[PDB]
Amino acid sequence: DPYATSVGHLIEKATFAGVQTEDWGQFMHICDIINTTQDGPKDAVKALKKRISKNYNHKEIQLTLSLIDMCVQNCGPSFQSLIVKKEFVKENLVKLLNPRYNLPLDIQNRILNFIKTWSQGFPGGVDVSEVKEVYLDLVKK
């Protein structure tokens, strides 16, 4: 279970349906944990993947994306490499752009924006070949 792991639980709570705003103090604490534990990055992405997947909640997705954008720029490629994997962007993030989830243009453009930004590559390893194509498709159609 994703929300079971130490850092997994902090994520479940930081993006809980209840909260109506971003607890940036908490998100930071989350990143620091991601950077301390041995498998924090992997375990974190499993929880984020959960929270995101086929979710119809506005704020949960809004908060989760904000939480993602945080880790992306506060944790090395050890994290960035798992978020740009096709298993995440194509089978989770981009799914939300489907009409079925009727999410607002606000959140929609934010999704495209991550794709476009992550497609720009990050410093160091991180292979963005996949998300690079996931972006191109959103542009073509």
UniProtKB/Swiss-Prot annotation:
Post-translational modifications: Phosphorylated on tyrosines by FYN and LYN.
Cellular localization per UniProt: Golgi apparatus, Golgi stack; Endosome membrane; Cytoplasm; Membrane
Domain VHS: 14-141
Entry similarity comment: Belongs to the TOM1 family.
Role: Probable adapter protein involved in signaling pathways. Interacts with the SH2 and SH3 domains of various signaling proteins when it is phosphorylated. May promote FYN activation, possibly by disrupting intramolecular SH3-dependent interactions.
Subunit details: Interacts with FYN, GRB2 and PIK3R1 when phosphorylated. Interacts with LYN.
Protein's recorded name: TOM1-like protein 1
